[PDB]
Every structure is written in structure tokens, then in C-alpha cells.
Amino acid sequence: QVQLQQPGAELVKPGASVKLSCKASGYTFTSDWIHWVKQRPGHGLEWIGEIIPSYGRANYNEKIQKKATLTADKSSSTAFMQLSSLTSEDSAVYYCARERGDGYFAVWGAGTTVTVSSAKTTPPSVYPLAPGSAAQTNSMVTLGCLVKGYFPEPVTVTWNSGSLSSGVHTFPAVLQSDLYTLSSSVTVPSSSWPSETVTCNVAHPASSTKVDKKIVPRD
Amino acid sequence: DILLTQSPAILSVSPGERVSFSCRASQSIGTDIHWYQQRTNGSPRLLIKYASESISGIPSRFSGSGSGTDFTLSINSVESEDIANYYCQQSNRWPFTFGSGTKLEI
Amino acid sequence: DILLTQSPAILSVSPGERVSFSCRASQSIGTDIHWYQQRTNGSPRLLIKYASESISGIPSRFSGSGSGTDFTLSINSVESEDIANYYCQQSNRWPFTFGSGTKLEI
Amino acid sequence: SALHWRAAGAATVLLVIVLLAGSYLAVLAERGAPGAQLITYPRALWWSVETATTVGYGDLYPVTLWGRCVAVVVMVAGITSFGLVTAALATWFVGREQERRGH
Amino acid sequence: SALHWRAAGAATVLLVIVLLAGSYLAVLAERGAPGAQLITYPRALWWSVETATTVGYGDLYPVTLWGRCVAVVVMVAGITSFGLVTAALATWFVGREQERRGH
Ligand SMILES: CCCCCCCCCO
Ligand SMILES: CCCCCCCCCO
Structure with missing residues (x-):
């Protein structure tokens, strides 16, 4: 422990x-x-x-x-x-x-x-990032989530409650006008999504908030 | 205050090769030197204590050597997960002090 | 005879900033180093004894650190009245000796 | 058992206790003093044994007032204990020589 | 009280006096000799205790003739005093063993 x-x-x-x-x-x-x-x-x-x-x-x-x-x-x-x-x-x-x-x-x-x-504490807005309708896909697919406008650092981003670690990139935050923003990307085999769910968990300690956002294909 | 010099600050190596980090103390400190690994966004992790004593849970490709003022942290057959910052720390004289750290790059 | 090197000889800083004077001894002297302040036309005044012990009557923005051969006198948030010459002095071995002094300039 | 023999054992127990307490207290007293080397328990315990026996290697020693006070208690406890064992051995030999002389 | 016990106390008082006088005299003897470290009273007193107990840290010692002469008086006073305490403990144990044997 x-x-x-x-x-x-x-x-x-x-x-x-x-x-x-x-x-x-x-x-x-x-x-x-x-x-x-x-x-x-x-x-x-x-x-x-x-x-x-x-x-x-x-x-x-x-x-x-x-x-x-x-x-x-x-x-x-x-x-x-x-x-x-x-x-x-x-x-x-x-x-x-x-x-x-x-x-x-x-x-x-x-x-x-x-x-x-x-500056004042501000919880993050989490937006899904699914591929566009015209995007072709290989044997692998990339998804992500946009964590925007939060303060102060840090935020912890996990995929599927941490059960998915392989293929994950969480970019450093960028500061612009007293608010941070960053994205996290995940890559899974094409065949497994949207079959098996893919959700990103975003916890922002400063505001005691942790939101989820499932990534489903656009319309 | 014991000054620990870690140079070079950045070390570039090809996969699978043996690499060695350097740590020079401003005065003799026996073998009271300890090494930590800190990956991106992670917290420090003890790798070697007292210059050459292995810590359980640490891969066998990590070893340390030296005594006096010159110490070395070695990694045999470096691999991707070893990418990180490495720090040395002395406990011979008060106060404990840290080296500036060396970044491993593949 | 212990040689005490104080360099730089002149230190320029902006008001309110933290400043540090350096004193290197030619050989290890534990913490037997003392610091004095001497303003224009004034006589020397003890600021710190034994490297880091505060003297009553001296502002809390004055502190000292170091041991062995490297010592530092620090002033947090420097102000006009700190403008003066600063000297270090050792009492580890006979005869006692003084450093060449460092002048603070704002 | 006889006094001297009991006092010896007691001396051995007090000494061991002094060594341990001394090691703990030395670290407590020395950390905080730049340059101090008597700052980890294992070597501090080695230091305590060196001090009690006055072996004089000179590889470790307190530089602070309280550490030195601790050192004195350990030196005295060690010198006294070993001296007490000598007196016990003396009393033992004296008793035997008395018998051997039919006194 | 008994002789040995009295002589011990006396030994303890003389030793303390020797430590103090020794500390004062060592500084007086050592200042003036370039390289000397036994030149301030607090550490000189620590030096006096180290010397009396022969603990052997080797962190301080006189380099002048007079300082060394002072050192010898302190060593002898210390060795003698601790030795005298041992003899006192011996006499004490011997007296008791006599009683215990109904002699
Ligand atoms: C004889 C001196 C008393 C025991 C040592 C106490 C040290 C406390 C910590 O500073
Ligand atoms: C046994 C030597 C006499 C005591 C020391 C005297 C030193 C006087 C100062 O030089």
C-alpha cells in the first residue's frame, strides 16, 4: 500500500x-x-x-x-x-x-x-475527440479528450479507470490568459472500438472534481 | 555542505548499450551515496543505496560503483523505460544534499 | 595561515532582492567563520558567529550557511542601510585571519 | 550470587542501554549541525561502542555541545563498567587466594 | 566515610579542577603557534575531557611543548582518577565478600 x-x-x-x-x-x-x-x-x-x-x-x-x-x-x-x-x-x-x-x-x-x-480555482471542461466521418482508419484508431480552461495545475488523466495504459499520451498543459488546457490521446486496435468502451477520467485536485467522458463515434 | 556534481547533464545512448552516470562529491564521503530515478511527472524512486547495494524490486541491469569522491550508476542494456532523470544524494555529512541530475536520452 | 577568499569584491543588487556574499577558506575550518559589517567611517560590527548563529540586535534578514571551506552570508530583501563592506574571519587555527571584504552596492 | 558478580552483570546491562540510548541521542543532537557525520543510527551505534571502549579510531565524533555531553556519559559508562569488571575479577581472585592459603 | 570512597570523591574534584585549569592553560600555551587548533576555551575543555578519558577521537591536540606538558598532566590525572575509582570499587567488593563468607 x-x-x-x-x-x-x-x-x-x-x-x-x-x-x-x-x-x-x-x-x-x-x-x-x-x-x-x-x-x-x-x-x-x-x-x-x-x-x-x-x-x-x-x-x-x-x-x-x-x-x-x-x-x-x-x-x-x-x-x-x-x-x-x-x-x-x-x-x-x-x-x-x-x-x-x-x-x-x-x-x-x-x-x-x-x-x-x-487567480481563482476553475474546474476543467472535458470535450471528447472522436475521428471525423471522412477519416480513414488503419489497423489502429486514435482517440482523445480535450481538457480545457482549468486552474491551477495539475490534472490527472486516465483511460478506462486506469485499465488502459498502453498507447496513451498526455501533453503538457499550456497557459493562456490565466487558464490551462491540454489534451490526452489514446490508441487502440481499430476492431476494439466502439465495440469496447473507451472513457477518459479527468481529476482536478484543486477543485475536488473528477469527471468522465465516454468517447463514442460522431453521429 | 557537500557539493555533488553530475556531468554530463544529458546522456544519449542507443538501445541495448551499457550506460554510466557520473557523480563527483566535493569531498570524500565513503560510500554514502544513493541513486534515484525520476520519470516524467513521477516522483523519485530509490535505485541503489550506499553506492552499490541493490534494492529489491529494481531490475538487475542497474548497478553502482565507486567510493570516496567518484561514483557511477550503470545500466546494462538500456531500454525505453529507463528514459528519465537520475539523481545522486549523499548522507555522509549534514545536511543531506542532491546532485543536479542527469537525463537519459535514447 | 588560513587564507580566506572573498569574491566578488563588489556586489550590485536591486532593492528588496536576496543577496549572498561568498567566503572560501584555503583549508577546512568546520564552522569557525564569523561575519562583520563595516559601514563608511564606522567600526566593524559582528553579524553572524560560527557561520550561522544569529547575534541579538541584528536584523532577521541576515543569515549564514556553510561548513568546511565554503561559507555564505545572506541578506533577504536588501535595503539601503545594508550598504557597506562585509568581512569574514576565521578562528579555527592560529592566527585568526580576515577575508579581503566584499562591498555591497545597490 | 555474590555482589561484585551481580554489579558486573548490572554494569553490562546499563552499558548496553547507554550504548543504544547514546546512539539515538547522538543523532538527535548532531543532525542540524553542518559538517556533522554522527547522523545515522547504525554508525552512531558503532560510534557508541568506540567511545565506551576508548578504542580511538577517530573516524567519528560529535561536533555539537549536546552530542559531546552524550559522548561523556558513554565514555564514563564504558570506563566505569570495564573498571567494575576488573574489580570483580580482583575480588574473585582474592577470595580464592585466601582459601588456597587456608585462611 | 571509608578512605577509598573519600579518596575517590577527592579524585573527582581534583580531576574537574585539572580539566578547567588544563583548558585555560592549553589555550594560553597554544595561541601563538601557527597551525594550533586548541585555541578557544569551549573546545579546549572538550579536549581536556577527551584527554582525561583517553577516548582518542583525534580531533584536537596540542602542538607546543607547554601544551603537551599540560596534556600529560591531564592524561595522568584522568588515568589515575579512573584507576582510583576501580580500586575503590575493588575494596568495596572485597569487604562485602568477606562478610558474605562470615569472615
Ligand atoms: C548528559 C547530557 C544529557 C543527555 C543528552 C540529551 C540530548 C538531547 C538532545 O539534544
Ligand atoms: C606540567 C607543566 C606545567 C603546567 C603548564 C604551564 C603552562 C604555562 C604557559 O605556557
Whole structure:
């Protein structure tokens, strides 16, 4: 099972603050340390700080401005990172990791994408993408879905509740006028569609929404 | 603070060939170096700990070597799923630090 | 005699930006490095002791980091009153020595 | 059993407990200090044994105030325990020599 | 109280005094010698404890004649004090074993 669970996203206004959480499961030892690592889009991993829940003591990276404050609840075995007075420089994916006190990060969370802006949360519009009537088809067919006008990142796109992984491309989002848009494509054998259903699932953590859209042939 | 230099930043190889990533520490750190793989949109994954110890669940084509200040992560017969960013991390002296990462390209 | 190199000798920054002064020791000195600020016609003033320990009476925007041979003095959101010369000093080995100093310019 | 022998066992148990607590506390005290190497439990436990025996390899040592305080408790516990075993061996030999002399 | 126990306490007091005086004197002896690291009181006191216990980390040591002379007094004071505690523990166990044997 998933050893560390983090919320998918957090939208924060410039100047405001947010408290990220990290719920752990699996084996727990008094010798465990919970670390937080920051990754700005396109950049590398940056160690932020650590905390030892069994004692509540925390240490931080001295080379960078201290934006975080770590704490942990031993009963709900959850670790928290309080980030305050954030600017756009603080927009990034924040991962939590567990170390058994022996130097390496055995397990990592999926990370929380934190966006700092004054824009407002906006759920995505999901439009189907079926071939046109005149399009000829080979032994394979390509379908997709358009996820348009959402904010902030990210969105997770899966095909048939995740049962279909092979032949899937989800393009990076493009930002235009305070709203993101991206498409995801899937390729299946021509014979299997529309015989067997093909549906894309789009979850947008920032707005706690997850919509489905079945891909059926145009008229 | 231990500086870990990973160069080249990008490594291009043909399918099935052996590839080696480099990691140089600014000072001697025994074998306290660990390697992680991070694929696109994915989170980091431990590949090798303490310079050469295999992690269960990781393909046998992954191995590590070195001690002191020079370390190497090797992949025998590289394949498509190995396409990703690779990072080294040291735990010899506080604070733990990461290398800048090397991207594998086929 | 421990040589402390402070480079660049002059650092130019815009108001409110974060700035970092560099200090490299010719040999490892743990965290036995101290930072002083000396304004025009003024006498030296202790800002940070032992690489990162804050001194009471010094603004919180001043911090230090590093160990071994590489040290950094940082100022978050620089302002006019920070205009001055900055020196590092080591106390790891006798005799104590000073760096050549870095001038902050806005 | 006899006192000295009991006190020895006790000394062995306290020492083991001091080694473990010492290893845990050393890591707690040292992480946070740039340059510190006494920061992972397995080597910290090796450090605790080195310290208790005063073997002096010099491959690991605390650089912080609290870590050094921890070091002192381990050194003293080790020096005292081994010294207590010596006294126990002494008491044992003395008792036997008395018998052997028909005293 | 009994002699050995008193002598032990005395040994503990003299040692503490030797540690402090030793720390002060080491700095006095070492400053002035280029390369010397035993030059600030807090670490000099850590050095004094290391020396008295012969723990052997090797992170600090005098390089001057007078500093080394100071080191010898601390080593001897430490070795002697811990050795005196061992003898006290021995005398204590021996007295008890005598009783326990109805002698
Ligand atoms: C003799 C010193 C007391 C034991 C060590 C406590 C350390 C706590 C963490 O900093
Ligand atoms: C045993 C040596 C005498 C004590 C040390 C005196 C040092 C004086 C300063 O140089």
C-alpha cells in the first residue's frame, strides 16, 4: 500500500500561507525521519528540512530562506509543513519522504503541487475527440479528450479507470490568459472500438472534481 | 555542505548499450551515496543505496560503483523505460544534499 | 595561515532582492567563520558567529550557511542601510585571519 | 550470587542501554549541525561502542555541545563498567587466594 | 566515610579542577603557534575531557611543548582518577565478600 499520502494540490495567494500534510502508513519506528523536498518545474530536487516525529525536533536547509515550519501528529501519524508568506518563487511540487535514519529516502509521496497566484480555482471542461466521418482508419484508431480552461495545475488523466495504459499520451498543459488546457490521446486496435468502451477520467485536485467522458463515434 | 556534481547533464545512448552516470562529491564521503530515478511527472524512486547495494524490486541491469569522491550508476542494456532523470544524494555529512541530475536520452 | 577568499569584491543588487556574499577558506575550518559589517567611517560590527548563529540586535534578514571551506552570508530583501563592506574571519587555527571584504552596492 | 558478580552483570546491562540510548541521542543532537557525520543510527551505534571502549579510531565524533555531553556519559559508562569488571575479577581472585592459603 | 570512597570523591574534584585549569592553560600555551587548533576555551575543555578519558577521537591536540606538558598532566590525572575509582570499587567488593563468607 501507499506509504505516504499527500494532497494533490494547493492554491495560495501571494503573501498567504498554506499547511501541507503527509499521512504515513506501513512500518513506523522511533528512528524515522520525515523529509520535505522542493522541486520547481524543470529544476532539480532541493532538500527543505526534516523532522523526527518520535521527538518532534526539526532541522532546516540553512542555504535557503526559511519559508517552512515542520510539525507532526504522532497519533494520526501525519507530518505537516507550514509554508508562509509565499511568492511565485514558492510555486513548485513539494514531496515528503521517509528515511529510516540510515541516510536514504526509501519512499516518497506523490507530491503536492503548490501554485501561488491571485487567480481563482476553475474546474476543467472535458470535450471528447472522436475521428471525423471522412477519416480513414488503419489497423489502429486514435482517440482523445480535450481538457480545457482549468486552474491551477495539475490534472490527472486516465483511460478506462486506469485499465488502459498502453498507447496513451498526455501533453503538457499550456497557459493562456490565466487558464490551462491540454489534451490526452489514446490508441487502440481499430476492431476494439466502439465495440469496447473507451472513457477518459479527468481529476482536478484543486477543485475536488473528477469527471468522465465516454468517447463514442460522431453521429 | 557537500557539493555533488553530475556531468554530463544529458546522456544519449542507443538501445541495448551499457550506460554510466557520473557523480563527483566535493569531498570524500565513503560510500554514502544513493541513486534515484525520476520519470516524467513521477516522483523519485530509490535505485541503489550506499553506492552499490541493490534494492529489491529494481531490475538487475542497474548497478553502482565507486567510493570516496567518484561514483557511477550503470545500466546494462538500456531500454525505453529507463528514459528519465537520475539523481545522486549523499548522507555522509549534514545536511543531506542532491546532485543536479542527469537525463537519459535514447 | 588560513587564507580566506572573498569574491566578488563588489556586489550590485536591486532593492528588496536576496543577496549572498561568498567566503572560501584555503583549508577546512568546520564552522569557525564569523561575519562583520563595516559601514563608511564606522567600526566593524559582528553579524553572524560560527557561520550561522544569529547575534541579538541584528536584523532577521541576515543569515549564514556553510561548513568546511565554503561559507555564505545572506541578506533577504536588501535595503539601503545594508550598504557597506562585509568581512569574514576565521578562528579555527592560529592566527585568526580576515577575508579581503566584499562591498555591497545597490 | 555474590555482589561484585551481580554489579558486573548490572554494569553490562546499563552499558548496553547507554550504548543504544547514546546512539539515538547522538543523532538527535548532531543532525542540524553542518559538517556533522554522527547522523545515522547504525554508525552512531558503532560510534557508541568506540567511545565506551576508548578504542580511538577517530573516524567519528560529535561536533555539537549536546552530542559531546552524550559522548561523556558513554565514555564514563564504558570506563566505569570495564573498571567494575576488573574489580570483580580482583575480588574473585582474592577470595580464592585466601582459601588456597587456608585462611 | 571509608578512605577509598573519600579518596575517590577527592579524585573527582581534583580531576574537574585539572580539566578547567588544563583548558585555560592549553589555550594560553597554544595561541601563538601557527597551525594550533586548541585555541578557544569551549573546545579546549572538550579536549581536556577527551584527554582525561583517553577516548582518542583525534580531533584536537596540542602542538607546543607547554601544551603537551599540560596534556600529560591531564592524561595522568584522568588515568589515575579512573584507576582510583576501580580500586575503590575493588575494596568495596572485597569487604562485602568477606562478610558474605562470615569472615
Ligand atoms: C548528559 C547530557 C544529557 C543527555 C543528552 C540529551 C540530548 C538531547 C538532545 O539534544
Ligand atoms: C606540567 C607543566 C606545567 C603546567 C603548564 C604551564 C603552562 C604555562 C604557559 O605556557
